[PDB]
């Protein structure tokens, strides 16, 4: 498509009790409801867990404070009173025609102590080992929700860098969705007995050594709940 890039604050420093806004800009122009904004939180140990989609519409269990928005020519995340369990890197999600794209996410920090207001399930196996030229299958059980009802993402991310869509199956039918950048790289399927999502990854390389999650998407909302990641090696 087009090379664009998406781009949020490296870092914001609050203090619990405080209204804080994360934007997200788009390097094409303005932010629109076509580019249907997600946003997902990531604690440590790499948990993933998205908070807005759609613009504006609220994931399940997503606490009150957050709220998604366009604001000017950006997306906006509002947290209408931080807490000090919200210090966490918080990643932005464009739809761009044919992909998603992540910004590099912002890094928030909740400065001193404060107070504040206080199932589906996806398991992937921890890692996965592989040789150069191999071929390697991911798996990603989900229970809690009604498996066909729901899309699921791939997203490879890199440690230390940023993360990539990868591509999108919708278990009712079995229509794909992929990035161009995987497009022939991987392959998604469905085992709906099981209630499994699977990936191929075809002929591997050193650069597929990262961890890759699976992650469910109700359509116009946001990629709510997410695997745990299993993270990929290649021997070398
Ligand atoms: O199916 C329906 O009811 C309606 C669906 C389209 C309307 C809402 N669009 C999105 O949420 C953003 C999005 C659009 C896609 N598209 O429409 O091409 C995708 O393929 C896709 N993905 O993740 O792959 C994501």
Same mark, same amino acid.
């Given at each position: 498509?087009?090379?664009?890039?998406?781009?949020?604050?490296?870092?914001?420093? *609050?203090?619990?009790?405080?209204?804080?806004?994360? !934007?997200?800009?788009?390097? !094409?122009?303005?932010?629109?409801?076509?580019?249907?904004?997600?946003?997902?939180?990531?604690?440590?140990?790499?948990? /993933?867990? #998205?908070?807005?989609?759609?613009?504006?519409?609220?994931?399940?269990?997503?606490?009150?404070?957050?709220?998604?928005?366009?604001?000017?020519?950006?997306?906006?995340?509002?947290?209408? #009173?931080?807490? *000090?369990?919200?210090?966490?890197?918080? /990643?932005?999600?464009?739809?761009?025609?044919?992909?998603?794209? /992540?910004?590099?996410?912002?890094?928030? !920090?909740?400065?001193?102590?404060?107070?504040?207001?206080?199932?589906?399930?996806?398991?992937?196996?921890?890692?996965?080992?592989?040789?150069? #030229?191999?071929?390697?299958?991911?798996?990603?059980?989900?229970?809690?929700? !009604? /498996?066909?009802?729901?899309? &699921?993402?791939?997203?490879?991310?890199?440690?230390?860098?940023?993360?990539?869509?990868?591509?999108?199956?919708?278990?009712?039918?079995?229509? *794909?969705?992929?990035?161009?950048?995987?497009?022939?790289?991987?392959?998604?399927?469905?085992?709906?007995?099981?209630?499994?999502?699977? &990936?191929?990854?075809?002929?591997?390389?050193?650069?597929?050594?990262?961890?890759?999650?699976?992650?469910?998407?109700?359509?116009?909302?946001? &990629?709510?709940?997410?695997?745990?990641? *299993?993270?990929?090696?290649?021997?070398?």
């Amino acid at each position: 498509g087009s090379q664009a890039v998406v781009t949020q604050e490296s870092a914001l420093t *609050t203090s619990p009790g405080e209204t804080v806004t994360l !934007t997200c800009r788009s390097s !094409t122009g303005a932010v629109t409801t076509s580019n249907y904004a997600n946003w997902v939180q990531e604690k440590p140990d790499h948990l /993933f867990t #998205g908070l807005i989609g759609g613009t504006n519409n609220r994931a399940p269990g997503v606490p009150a404070r957050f709220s998604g928005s366009l604001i000017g020519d950006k997306a906006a995340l509002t947290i209408t #009173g931080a807490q *000090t369990e919200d210090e966490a890197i918080y /990643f932005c999600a464009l739809w761009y025609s044919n992909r998603w794209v /992540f910004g590099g996410g912002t890094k928030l !920090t909740v400065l001193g102590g404060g107070g504040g207001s206080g199932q589906v399930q996806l398991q992937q196996p921890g890692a996965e080992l592989v040789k150069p #030229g191999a071929s390697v299958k991911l798996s990603c059980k989900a229970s809690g929700y !009604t /498996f066909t009802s729901y899309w &699921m993402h791939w997203v490879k991310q890199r440690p230390g860098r940023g993360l990539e869509w990868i591509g999108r199956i919708d278990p009712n039918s079995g229509g *794909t969705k992929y990035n161009e950048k995987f497009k022939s790289k991987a392959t998604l399927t469905v085992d709906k007995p099981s209630s499994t999502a699977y &990936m191929q990854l075809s002929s591997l390389t050193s650069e597929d050594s990262a961890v890759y999650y699976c992650a469910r998407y109700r359509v116009y909302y946001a &990629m709510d709940y997410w695997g745990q990641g *299993t993270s990929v090696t290649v021997s070398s």
